Design a binder for this molecule. Structure first.
Ligand SMILES: [K+]
Ligand SMILES: [K+]
Ligand SMILES: [K+]
Lengths: 203, 205
């Protein structure tokens, strides 16, 4: 396997490092995660922009995480690890408070009511994010899907989160230094709007 | 004119403070009272009054020149469930008792883009408090705007205050919302391209 020869980037045993992720990276830098990494343009780009932040990207499909490891093998970035796990197993990999941020980019919308439970912004997953971040983290979410974003804002509110940032047209707003995904850098810059939100826990 | 409002004092209540806690006696019924801050020409409020006869409506508008037009719409379209007040949002606490108002409507409110004018926005914490002082914890705010900057600010301001977002549309004219009454200004956004944003926010009970 191609994943075995690059086992320094793609970790096959993440559960063994629960509470000890600072020993893997070798520093106490904040750990920011991404659920649904895909081909990895986002995670690799964020890695090069922020060398002093540790990134861990999770992806369900083996066939696509292969391209993500290649992008981290291209750019010398030593601050990115990739895991082939489900979002439900994040609590088996991280201790409460070990993660400082969760990134959700163009997550699967699942518009049908029966599949509300599958949306990465539904209460079940918001609970999993809390269980790995404690009360000191944040969720940075961006999508071009109107329905999912509308649902997400209501879901964040119902759960009791604080909306600290919201952009209803990201491209003609402040491009602080946001890295685009493969899908984002592919479709329109002056067409369909991209929505963005930053939510955190109240203290 | 000031002569027109004095002639039509049954619609344009000149002494609203006198009816504090007694607004049900003005309408002659115990139906819910819903208010609109910044009525303008009054198309929204007259349309809502026509659509919902079982709800009592009170529109407030500071600009005396434009409230005259709002009164004319109520005078012609004989609805008995609409009263209009020539006051500001700060005076709402002198006019209503806690729990007397069940809903606050905000339509295309002044954006006030500049940071130094944040406190003048109808969705700022001060006005949210004024709305709580007339609604208690059992009401809601129904807000519509085309201004991206104001909507974004409002969402964060509603969140900071601890309010619950129950409805949100980021393109109202292409949404499910049936029975949507449009303002004069809203009627041009149908096929211009630019989206109208809408939110319904309530208190946690
Ligand atoms: K994704
Ligand atoms: K909220
Ligand atoms: K208005």
């Amino acid at each position: 396997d191609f994943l075995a020869e690059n086992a320094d980037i793609a970790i096959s045993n993440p559960a063994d490092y629960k509470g000890k992720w600072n020993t893997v990276f070798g520093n106490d830098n904040p750990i920011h995660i991404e659920v649904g990494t895909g081909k990895g343009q986002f995670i690799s780009g964020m890695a090069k922009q922020n060398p002093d932040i540790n990134y861990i990207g999770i992806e369900l499909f083996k066939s696509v995480i292969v391209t993500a490891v290649q992008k981290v093998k291209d750019s010398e970035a030593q601050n990115v690890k990739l895991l082939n796990i489900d979002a439900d197993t994040l609590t088996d990999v991280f201790e409460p408070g070990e993660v400082k941020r969760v990134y959700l980019n163009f997550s699967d919308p699942w518009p049908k009511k029966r599949h509300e439970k599958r949306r990465l912004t539904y209460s079940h997953f918001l609970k999993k994010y809390e269980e790995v971040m404690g009360k000191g983290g944040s969720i940075h979410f961006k999508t071009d899907n109107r329905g999912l974003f509308e649902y997400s804002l209501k879901s964040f509110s119902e759960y009791g989160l604080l909306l600290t940032y919201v952009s209803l047209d990201l491209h003609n707003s402040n491009l602080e230094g946001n890295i685009m995904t493969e899908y984002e850098e592919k479709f329109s810059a002056l067409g369909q709007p991209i929505y963005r939100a930053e939510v955190e826990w109240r203290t």
